[PDB]
């Protein structure tokens, strides 16, 4: 339920010599901070409204840690070239996800730490925060290194300690934004294709967050083994939108129902085709 | 397996000159260090290279600059040498665990090379008494008058280097504490079963290598230029 | 940072303890122990975060809830004499600042047996040299005289202590150093 994440990305680029580091931090699936090297004056910016209050002694704090990460990836990126015998001066990507999950009780539930290289998985910190999982043979090099160097301890001390301690604080303020939501505004549309056949598309606009569900049905019976559904798309206004469709014989429109399920809704939205 | 080495182990140079100390690992550790420690204090960090052209200051950056063009190497530069920059320098490397230090380079920055001297050396035969009192015989070497303390004293029996039953002074003592540039002295003992020294076939040689000046070192003085050399002193066994 | 006692006495056999008070610890920071024998450069001994690590050589014991720690050295030998450093190294930082640690001296054993012998150089000349030997556990050594600190040598066969002295003056012999002071007074001319 209550989780904090940090997605990091370092991307090598042709001739540029220096990679582009981008650190994005999430709180309950909601971005609240972001760092980017390319920026005019590279540093952490508050991506959320409730972060504006944080003192400068915190922004000069993070950016200094970000600058530190940036170099770590820079070095780690050169090491990989060796492992895979990739040549220098080229585009390669190294990503990292890390954060902590909390249960109903605001004690730590699970810790997260995993690296990826070139899209693929590389090495990950297991659920016990003691051992490592190595994807390909190269990662077994990194693991052996991190084993004999006692790397796990450092990450566990964070996930459990500092990580959690700060998520609480981010929830002492976030619990005034990540609670309010916008509701869907569904409406079926009628489109004709092929002789004696029409597609009925059930739209749903203006909802937040993106998590939602659309259902078609025949005479009341659940239908999904035949429907066409498109992934949730961002409206671009802070809200999202989605729709599903069905192909049905002409003159049989009113037979179908379209129920819409969303968080910020008191009760499912049953819809039908109008004149 | 885990060795770190530094060339010019000993080095003397005149004030104002360009000093260049080197250090290699041949294990391609990402990060390397330059430390110095004077007989007085302890280790202070000069520079730390995280990787090639990534170098950061440290504690005593003033007076030094560094160059990391390969992981394996890491050179320390003194543009204008200074008298007080006459410390001992340690190079190091790490991959994430602990740091792996080198052997140390002894750099003496002299204001005037006329203070430099090779060591006069002599061996002393065992006391007739000790051989009948404790049944053993102790030889004593004495490296006298030399500067600076760039000396390594060794024992050689019949041609073989011997660390068995050998003891050498840790700190060379000053023959005149008052003077600021006090000239040095050193000693070492070699204890051997009395029966052994009673044979005039054995060869006892006390060797002490000096690390002084070299080629490019210009020298005007009338006394032979005090360059790196191996002053020695010998002594044959006595059955008398 | 950390803090350690300047000195620390010990003897050939005794198991040594080396304190290291270190409150105000980030918990994100480890604790390392380096040993630096005179002449040589610092070399690694052991480290730990919590619990109680250990090696083939020494035992590291971190105090409960940090704030302090202790290094244990089992049946120590002479070669285990040096200056042991206790540094705090952040898990995300390669920098570690050395203090001056703890100078550990380790006294051997074997019964003393003062003697003091006089020797001449193989090139039989005028220069003479006095040799003070076997003054186990007795610091002193209090003009134009030259006296070196006690040098402990471990004869591989059968212990053994010694020190050298001279004064250039080819004339005299043990004239100053050793003068109605310590020792049985009965030397050997």
């Amino acid at each position: 339920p209550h989780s904090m994440r940090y997605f990091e990305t370092a991307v090598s680029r042709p001739g540029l010599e220096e990679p582009r580091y981008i650190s994005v931090g999430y709180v309950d699936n909601k971005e609240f901070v972001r760092f980017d090297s390319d920026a005019e004056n590279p540093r952490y910016e508050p991506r959320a409204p409730w972060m504006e209050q944080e003192g400068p002694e915190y922004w000069e704090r993070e950016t200094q840690k970000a600058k530190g990460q940036e170099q770590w990836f820079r070095v780690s990126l050169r090491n990989l070239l060796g492992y895979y015998n990739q040549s220098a001066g080229g585009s390669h990507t190294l990503q990292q996800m890390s954060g902590c999950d909390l249960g109903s009780d605001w004690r730590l539930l699970r810790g997260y730490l995993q690296f990826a290289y070139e899209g693929r998985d590389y090495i990950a910190l297991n659920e016990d925060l003691k051992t490592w999982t190595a994807a390909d043979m190269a990662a077994q090099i990194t693991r052996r290194k991190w084993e004999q160097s006692g790397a796990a301890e450092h990450y566990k001390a964070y996930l459990e300690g500092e990580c959690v301690e700060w998520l609480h604080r981010y929830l002492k303020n976030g619990n005034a934004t990540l609670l309010r939501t916008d509701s869907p505004k569904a409406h079926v549309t009628h489109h004709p294709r092929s002789k004696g056949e029409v597609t009925l598309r059930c739209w749903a606009l203006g909802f937040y967050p993106a998590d939602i569900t659309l259902t078609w049905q025949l005479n009341g019976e659940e239908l999904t083994q035949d429907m066409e559904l498109v992934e949730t798309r961002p409206a671009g206004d802070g809200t999202f939108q989605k729709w599903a469709s069905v192909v049905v014989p002409l003159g049989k429109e009113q037979n179908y129902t379209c129920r819409v399920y969303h968080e910020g809704l008191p009760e499912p939205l049953t819809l039908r085709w109008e004149p | 397996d885990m060795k770190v080495t530094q060339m010019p182990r000993y080095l003397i140079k005149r004030m104002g000159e360009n000093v260049l100390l080197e250090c290699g690992q041949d294990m391609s550790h990402e990060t390397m260090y330059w430390y110095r420690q004077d007989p007085g204090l302890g280790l202070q960090l000069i520079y730390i290279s995280y990787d090639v052209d990534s170098n950061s200051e440290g504690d005593i950056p003033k007076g030094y600059r560094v160059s990391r063009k390969k992981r394996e190497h890491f050179s320390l530069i003194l543009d204008s040498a200074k008298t007080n920059q006459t410390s001992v320098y340690f190079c190091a490397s790490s991959f994430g665990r602990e740091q792996y230090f080198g052997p140390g380079t002894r750099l003496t920055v002299l204001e005037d090379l006329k203070n430099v001297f090779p060591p006069e050396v002599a061996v002393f035969e065992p006391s007739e008494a000790e051989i009948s009192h404790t049944q053993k015989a102790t030889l004593v070497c004495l490296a006298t008058g030399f500067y600076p303390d760039h000396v390594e004293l060794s024992w050689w029996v019949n041609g073989k280097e011997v660390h068995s039953g050998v003891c050498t002074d840790p700190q060379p003592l000053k023959e005149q504490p008052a003077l600021n540039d006090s000239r040095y002295a050193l000693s070492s003992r070699l204890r051997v079963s009395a029966t052994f020294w009673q044979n005039p076939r054995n060869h006892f040689r006390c060797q002490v290598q000096f690390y002084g000046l070299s080629e490019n070192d210009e020298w005007t003085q009338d006394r032979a230029k005090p360059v790196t050399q191996i002053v020695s002193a010998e002594a044959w066994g006595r059955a008398d | 940072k950390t803090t350690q006692p300047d000195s620390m006495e010990s003897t050939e056999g005794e198991t040594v303890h080396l304190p290291c008070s270190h409150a105000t610890i980030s918990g994100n920071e480890y604790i390392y122990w380096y040993r630096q024998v005179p002449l040589q450069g610092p070399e690694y001994v052991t480290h730990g975060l919590q619990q109680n690590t250990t090696n083939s050589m020494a035992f590291l014991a971190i105090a409960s809830d940090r704030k302090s720690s202790t290094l244990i050295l089992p049946h120590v030998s002479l070669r285990d004499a040096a200056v042991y450093h206790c540094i705090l190294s952040g898990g995300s930082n390669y920098k570690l600042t050395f203090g001056k640690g703890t100078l550990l001296t380790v006294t051997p054993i074997q019964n003393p047996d003062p003697a003091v012998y006089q020797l001449r150089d193989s090139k039989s000349s005028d220069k003479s040299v006095c040799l003070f030997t076997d003054f186990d556990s007795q610091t002193n050594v209090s003009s134009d005289v030259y006296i070196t600190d006690k040098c402990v040598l471990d004869m591989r066969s059968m212990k053994s202590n010694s020190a050298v002295a001279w004064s250039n003056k080819s004339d005299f012999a043990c004239a100053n150093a050793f003068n109605n002071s310590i020792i049985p007074e009965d030397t050997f001319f």
């Binding site: 901070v33 990460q69 770590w72 780690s76 991190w146 160097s149 790397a151 990450y155 | 665990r97 | 995300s92």
Partner: peptide, 10 residues
Amino acid sequence: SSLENFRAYV
């Protein structure tokens, strides 16, 4: 506050 990776790189 974000994570500050372990000194040991990949």
